[PDB]
Nucleic acid binder design. Sequence first.
DNA 1: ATTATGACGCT
DNA 2: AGCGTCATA
Length: 430
Amino acid sequence: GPHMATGQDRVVALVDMDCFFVQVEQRQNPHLRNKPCAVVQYKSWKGGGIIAVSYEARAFGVTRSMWADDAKKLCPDLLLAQVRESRGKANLTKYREASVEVMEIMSRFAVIERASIDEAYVDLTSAVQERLQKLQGQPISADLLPSTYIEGLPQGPTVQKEGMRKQGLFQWLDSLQIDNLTSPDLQLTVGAVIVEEMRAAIERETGFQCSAGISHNKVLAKLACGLNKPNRQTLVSHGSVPQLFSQMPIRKIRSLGGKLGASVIEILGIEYMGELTQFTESQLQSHFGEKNGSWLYAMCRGIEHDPVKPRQLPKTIGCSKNFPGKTALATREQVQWWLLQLAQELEERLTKDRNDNDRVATQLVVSIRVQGDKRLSSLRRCCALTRYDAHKMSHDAFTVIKNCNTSGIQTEWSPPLTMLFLCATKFSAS
DNA sequence: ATTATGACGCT
DNA sequence: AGCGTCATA
Ligand SMILES: [Mn+2]
Ligand SMILES: [Mn+2]
Ligand SMILES: [Mn+2]
């Protein structure tokens, strides 16, 4: 009873940009605003590959990983912005720099964990305590939560969407006990007030809209964030978890979207997150391992302890290119030319990183894929990264992969390379 | 012929 | 270390 950990110790948010690369291009080019629009990479092959889609375009059924030629069949007036190409390859610098804009604003409110190019977790526990003390037991007005959904509400004894949101929010605020500074529901609510402020700052200062989730841990915050995209935020309380999870496919939870999630479904013969509660911790550990089993046992009850790491910067800087079909690299000079291209982009990004962030990478990882291999990577080798010099790095990368060439004579490369990848790792302060 | 990333876990 | 898994625009 009094000793059941309920995982309500923290307030955690996840802020995720809406259709992020599209918004970056729409800010740059006002003609793309409020239009069905997508961002594409390359063009020659089937119109290019779509990697981001505006919500207007999603209404036509356009998705990521769709060829633009096919997207145009669903949406003839679809507008397209192309990813920059430099040194023969897609270059994502504009989006990385836009990401930094957003991450630096979020960092003014709390220490953040950069989780992708367009999202970060925030531990708001401390900030909530201070806002609460400042609050002096004054109720939280609905006006402080103008874009917030309370998951699970309204419920019990209007056909418009904004009307429903307000009803739910009213029920939530009506039930709150603002008298108790240690009340988790209150703490989440104040967390949501801060995230409204955060999201307003991001939009004011960048032009970019985002969504967010507020809960007691990262997995619930991430899940919450997606519930009312775009341009809205969602509070998932501890109490909302049983109903929420009772019809939530297991694959929707972060980390369960792949083989593990499929094995949970197959081995246990269940479909929804909530169904996990009927297994003992030892039962889950027996099937999925000690760590996974303990994680599942707590997660299906709404509990997770994974901390928000204080890391705002990526800990690796990498450059990669596929060489699909018959563009696969079959000669030495080809392989060497592309290693140089990759190395030159890597040097440029590394040098900028050193100046901005007072650190130096010390290890170079070289990865290739060979024709026939289903795996993402066929081979990964490391060597020392001692100088930010593209020609040295590309020469070194070649040295480490030299022996993968099975051809008798050295001018040819066989079997042809379908992927090159250079990654700088192991940063030290400088 | 989705591609270009990036983090974390296992052994 | 090198490989595998999972994730995101
Ligand atoms: Mn996003
Ligand atoms: Mn995201
Ligand atoms: Mn996405």
